[PDB]
Amino acid sequence: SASFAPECTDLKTKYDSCFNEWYSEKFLKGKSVENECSKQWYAYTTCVNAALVKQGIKPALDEAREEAPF
Amino acid sequence: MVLLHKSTHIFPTDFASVSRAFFNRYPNPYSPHVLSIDTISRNVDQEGNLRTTRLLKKSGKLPTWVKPFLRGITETWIIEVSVVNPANSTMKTYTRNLDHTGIMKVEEYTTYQFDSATSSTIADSRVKFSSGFNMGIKSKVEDWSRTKFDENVKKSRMGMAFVIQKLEEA
Numbered sequence: 001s002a003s004f005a006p007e008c009t010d011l012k013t014k015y016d017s018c019f020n021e022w023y024s025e026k027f028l029k030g031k032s033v034e035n036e037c038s039k040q041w042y043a044y045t046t047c048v049n050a051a052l053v054k055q056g057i058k059p060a061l062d063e064a065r066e067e068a069p070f
Numbered sequence: 071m072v073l074l075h076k077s078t079h080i081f082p083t084d085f086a087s088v089s090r091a092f093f094n095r096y097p098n099p100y101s102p103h104v105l106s107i108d109t110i111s112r113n114v115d116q117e118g119n120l121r122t123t124r125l126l127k128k129s130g131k132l133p134t135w136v137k138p139f140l141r142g143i144t145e146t147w148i149i150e151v152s153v154v155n156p157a158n159s160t161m162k163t164y165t166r167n168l169d170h171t172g173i174m175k176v177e178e179y180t181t182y183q184f185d186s187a188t189s190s191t192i193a194d195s196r197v198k199f200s201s202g203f204n205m206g207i208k209s210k211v212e213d214w215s216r217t218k219f220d221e222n223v224k225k226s227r228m229g230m231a232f233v234i235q236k237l238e239e240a
């Protein structure tokens with residue numbers, strides 16, 4: 001499963017793997033709400049945001065993130 | 071013009087399997103046009119619900135008849151917003167295209183709800199197609215919308231079923 005920015009893909013995988021364990025084994029079992037994946041998350045999201053800055057879509061994404069569909 | 075479509079599907083497995091499948095749906099062989107997906111934000115909120123925004127890139131192609139009206143569109147960005155409520159076993163999801171919205175906006179709400187009396191997760195979908203840019207002839211755009219809705223209904227549920235399986239088989 002690739003990131004839209006290829007330099008972020010291996011970082012995404014590591015974050016996704018950590019989240020997947022946390023989600024199944026902790027969140028759904030009501031055993032945690034802490035960010036136990038913060039290391040993998042902040043590394044990944046740093047790589048993504050650096051990439052998004054140069055992306056034409058960024059303003060449309062920023063707007064979309066303010067809306068509340070639910 | 072606004073066109074609303076609806077569908078329902080039942081997955082005969084538990085909430086944890088469906089909601090996990092949703093977060094891990096890509097890649098699968100039923101969605102070959104999804105080039106990438108990224109998580110943009112994720113946090114647990116005030117009420118203990120999981121809030122996730124993701125960004126997908128998808129390739130595509132316009133039908134030939136729209137050639138004199140529309141230029142070549144071959145890629146689209148899609149936002150995907152979801153809320154998981156573990157106390158209720160509910161997952162709400164929303165998607166829409168981020169670009170080409172002046173030509174056509176396609177919005178989808180899909181809710182996954184576990185029903186314990188039947189030990190199944192029911193998926194209700196509603197999809198709205200909206201456009202104020204009238205290109206081309208209305209009934210052909212409508213046909214396109216029905217075709218697209220039906221294709222997505224099947225791709226979505228086949229992909230989900232594929233991934234639920236693969237995770238079941240470890």
Ligand SMILES: CCCCCCCCCCCCCCCC(=O)OC[C@H](COP(=O)(O)O)OC(=O)CCCCCCCCCCCCCCC
Pocket residue numbers: 077100101103104126128136143146148163165166167169170173174175176177178179180193195197205206210211214218222223224225226227229
């Ligand atoms: C004839 C004129 C046409 C004009 C063309 C204008 C170009 C822009 C149109 C692109 C709009 C597409 C974005 C729509 C976003 C949206 O609302 O929701 C639909 C989105 C994408 O829509 P599209 O497949 O139509 O591009 O769902 C996807 O993410 C699809 C990814 C590939 C298939 C995987 C299956 C998952 C589908 C959804 C899962 C949810 C569960 C329940 C489903 C029943």
